[model samples]
Target: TTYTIQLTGTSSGHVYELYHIFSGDLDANNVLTNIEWGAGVAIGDRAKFGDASEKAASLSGKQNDSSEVKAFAQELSNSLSAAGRTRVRSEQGTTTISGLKPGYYLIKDSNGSLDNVKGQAYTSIMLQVAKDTTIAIKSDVPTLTKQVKASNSENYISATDYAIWDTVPFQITVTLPSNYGDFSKYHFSVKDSMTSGMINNGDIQVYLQQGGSEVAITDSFSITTNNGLTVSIADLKTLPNVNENSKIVIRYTARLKDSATLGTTGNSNTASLTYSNNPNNNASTTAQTLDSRATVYTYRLRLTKVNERQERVAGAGFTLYKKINNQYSEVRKIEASSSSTFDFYGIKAGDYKLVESTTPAGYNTMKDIEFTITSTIDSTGALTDMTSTSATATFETDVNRGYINLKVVNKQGALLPNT
Candidate 1:
C-alpha cells in the first residue's frame, strides 16, 4: 500500500524537524525491507493516503499536539533508517534540517501536519535531495534506443486479460523499462495471431488506461475481438505531459463471454524505444562538436543502471558537475526517470563529472560518470555523430556502485577514451 502525507507550512519561518514512519522491518546491519514509495513519490504523499477533512485531527499534527507531531516524526525517521540511512543525526538549524540521507524523507513541525490555518489542506511537495547533498533536478530529454522485450511470438507483446465467469476476475501485470515515463503514447501493430498479427487487419477492442490521478486506471478501449487467441495493443507511449516515471496498468475483462473471453495476455518483456528532440530521430542522434575556442559542446547525456547482464536497474539517478578551472559547480542531475534520454543541454568545454545523485530506495548508485567533452570524437577533427556520442554505464544493487563511460575527443578532435 502507498501512503501520502500533505504538509502545509504553518509559519513563515523555516522549520527544522525530523519524523519517522514505520515501513517494513529491519533484518540486518545492511539490509532491510523499506516501505518504498514509487519513483518521484514522496513520503508525505504516502502519509496523506486515506486522509480526509473528517480525519484531520487523527492524521494531522493539530495545534499544541506535540505528541501527535512527534508520533508522525518517529514514523518518518524509522522509514528513513530502513531506506539505508545510517549514522542518522538531526542538527538543530534555525532554518534547514541538515545531514539527511540521499533517500526519501519527511520533515514535519511539532504540530500535526504543516498547516497554515484550521481545516486547511496544505500542499506537500515531494523533494528529491540529489546525492552528495545538493538541490538540483535534471530536466527530461528525448529517449533513444531501447532493449525492450518483445511479445512471445516476437511479433507482438500481449499485456491484456479479461474474465469470462460470473463475478470472477483476474489480474494482469507487465514489466517495463524502469525509466519508462508516465508520458507515453500507445501504438501497436495488431494482426490476427493465426495470420499476420498486425493492427492493419481490422478494428480491435482493447482496454487503455483511463482514470485516477497520477496512475489512474481507465477501463476503456474500442477494439473488436474477432475469433482470435491474441489481441494486441500497439505502441504504448506515455501521453504527452503525462508522468514519465509512472506505470501503465490495464485491468480488463472479456467483452464477449461466449466467444472471445480471456483477452490476449503475455509478457511485453522489456520493450526498448528511443527518443530524440529531433522528431525524425526520436530514438536517433546527430553528433555535435565544440572547438577549444568554442564556449560549449551540445550533446545528450545517457545514464543507465544495471547489473552485469545489462538489465536496467531501478531507482538509479545521476548528478553531473563541471570542475571548471578546479572549481566544482553542478551541471545536470538525472533520475532513472525514463529509460529513454536524459538530456543535458549546452554543456561548456570543461572538466565534467556526474555523481550518482540518488538511487532507488533499496539499490546502490552507479558512479564515476565524470567526463570532459573535447572538441571532437576522432582524429579527423570532424564533428562526432550521435551514434558515436554514446556513453555506457551500469549500477549494481548488491555490490559497489557502477561504472560510467564519459565521452571526450583527443586534441585533434578525436574522441578519447579516458582523458
Candidate 2:
C-alpha cells in the first residue's frame, strides 16, 4: 500500500529529516511483521539500536512507541550515512515526504534548519508507518512576558516613569508549553536581569498562576543569583497544579539608582524561559525562548526664569507640587538662587504645578503653571506617545528622548516679592 507522511506547522526555509530504522511488511490487520534493520543500515551496526523497551509489531491500532523510538534514533543518527536519511526542505509552511518505504521512521527537524532564527531546537517524533499519517511539529515555545510596577502603586505596566532610589517592582510570567506532559522530567528554568542603572532590592518570589490567582511555590525549585536571577526546576512535573494551560510567574524588586538612565531611553529589564525539547532521556536537547523586555523611564524638568524683555532674571524662588487624588502635594521647593535656570531632577509622569514663591524684588510673580505630563511607552523601551496639558508647556517627543520644558516670565513689580 502506498503511504505518505505529512509534517504540519513547518515554516519556510526549514529542513526536516526522516530515517528508516526498520523495514517490515504491513499485514491485513494493520500489523507490521518481518521487522529488521532498514536497507542502508548494515546488519553488523544493528547493535547500536540498543535495548529500548518497545516493539513495533506489538503496537495496536494508532499506537506508537514514541519514547523508545526517539531514543533509538538520537543515539544512531550520527552513525548513519547522509544517503541513509532523506532530507526535505520546506518551501511553504508544510513539508510533504514520500520517499521512505514501510518502516518505523524517526522524524526530527535538522539543527540550524530554520534560516531566519538560528539554533531553534524543535521537538522530535516517531511514527510507525503502517498507513498514511500526519504529525504536527512542536514549534511553539513558552512565552515570557515582563511587567513593571511603580512605587506605592497597585498596577503593573509594560513601561512607566520612575524616580531615582524608588523601589520598582517587576514580575515575569512564563507559560507552560502545550506538550507539557510529553517529557518524563521537564527541565524548566527562567532567568531575569536588570540593567546596570537599577540594583536588586528585594527577594524574588515564584508562583503558579491558575484560575486568575497566583499560588506561591517555595520548593521543588532552586535559585541562583550570582550574576542575575536564575530559577531552575529539576522536574516541572513534580510541581503542584501544573498543567499545559498553567503559567509560572516570578516577581522581584529593584531600586532605581542615582545613576539611572534619564530621558526617553529608559532602563530596561529582561526575562527568558528554557525547557527540554526532546522527549527521550538520551536526547538532552533543550531550547530557550527569545528574551522579553520591560522598561523604566525617568525625566527631569528644565525651568528657566526670564524677565518680560526675554533676558535671564535671577533672585526668583519656586516650588513644585504634584496632584494626587484631586489634592496637590509638595514635591520640591527651591529657595532664592543667583542663577536663572532652576533645574529639578528625578520627576516622573504626573499632573504638576510650578509656582513662583519668591520673585525679584521688582518683578511681578507669574500665575501658577499647571500642566499634566502623560506618556505611552512601547515594549522596545521607546516612548510612543507624549503630551503636556497646557499651551505654555511644550516638548517635541522623540522615541529615544522626551521631556517637558517651561519658560517662566516675570513682569515689573514694586518691592512686592510674595512669600
Candidate 3:
C-alpha cells in the first residue's frame, strides 16, 4: 500500500527534506496499525520520539504554531543522523511526497540545498503520511535598525548633529527571528559602514536588553574592524537566557572628522544584518536584511574679501576667533595670498568673530565683525532653520549650501592717529 502528503506555500528555488521517524498502516477510519521506528532512525534517537501513538496524534490535525509538535520536530531535526532523509524540490508553492511507507515524518526546509533562497527564513512541520495530508509553510527573517544617541538625552534616535571632532554614539538594535526555536543553530552578524569623513573608534560593546535592564555581554560574540565595523554572534541560541523575545544591541562610537560634510546633507552610517534562513543549515545558507541608517551633521563658514568694483582683493589678513564663557580666543589666522579668501571649515554653530589683522595698503582697518551661527534640525536630519548674523558687516550675507558666505568690502582710506 502507498500514501502521499501535499505541501502548500512551497516557493520556487527552495527544497524540503523529510525524516521518517515512525511507520505504520492506516485503515478507512484513519486509525494506525501498531507503529515501529521508521527507516534511517538511529537507536539513540528513539526515545525523543516519545510514544508512537502520542507523537502521531500530536501532528495529526492541521496546526497553528503548535509548540509541542514543534519541539518534537526541532529536536529530531537538530540531531540528524547518517540514516538519510527524503529530499524533494518545490515549485509554484506546492510539492507532493509520494511512494510513502505510511509513517510520521518530520519536515524542514534544507538551507544548504537552496541556492536562490539563501539568507531567507525556514519553516518546520510534522505530519503522519497515512492519508492525503496537506501542510502550509511559515517563515520569517530578522529585524534590524540603526540609531544615533541624542546629545542632550539618553534616548536613541534616527539623526543627530555633532561638532567636528565630537564623538557620536550609535547602536544597532536587532530582533531575532520569530522562528528561532525551530533552528538547530542560529547565525547572526551586523556590519556597519560610514562615509570616509567619519572615523570609527574602537570602543565597541555588546549588550543584552530586556525591558529597562541591559546586561553587558562578554561571550558568544566577536568584533572585527579589519575591513569594516562588524559584530558577529555565532549560534544565538547558545547565548545565556536568549530566545526570540530577547534583543541584542551592538553599541559603538565614531568621531566626526574635519573632512565631514556640513549641514542637512549629513554624514550617514548604515548597518545591515546577515541572518541564517534555514534552520537545518545555519552557517553557509544565510540572508541579508535591508540597511538601516543614522546621520550626523557639521557647519561651515566662508569669507570673500573684495573691493567696490567686485574685484578680488589681496594683501589682506584676518583672524577668526570663537567666544567661550564670554571671552573671545583666536581659532585661526591667515594672511592674504595672491587669491586671498578665508575659509573656516568643519565648524559648529556658535558665537564667533572675524577681525582684520592686516589691511591692504591705503585701506582702513575696519571694526571686527561679531556674529552668531544657529542651526536646527528634526529627527530625520532635515533642516528646520539655519541663520548667521552680524550687525558690523551687514553688507552682504548668503547662507546657502550649508555655509555662511560673507563678502568683506574694504574702502580706500588713510590711517588716522588717536590721542
Highest lDDT against the true fold, candidate: 3
Better of 1 and 3 by TM-score: 3
Task: Please report how far candidate 3 places residue 327 from its true position, in Å.
Answer: 8.6
What TM value does model 3 have? 0.63
Give TM-scores for every candidate, taking all chains together and pairing residue i with residue i: 0.21, 0.76, 0.63
Go through the candidates in order and give each one's C-alpha lDDT.
0.31, 0.70, 0.73
- Pitting candidate 2 against candidate 3, the one with the higher TM-score is 2
In candidate 1, what residue range of length 10 has the lowest lDDT sum? 288-297
lDDT of 3 by residue, 89-195 (tens): 87766889888677667777774564444445566445445477776665556788899887546899887666653578988899876667767787788888855
Error of 2 at 128 (Å): 3.5
- Cα lDDT of candidate 1 equals 0.31
Model 2 error, position 8 (Å)? 0.9
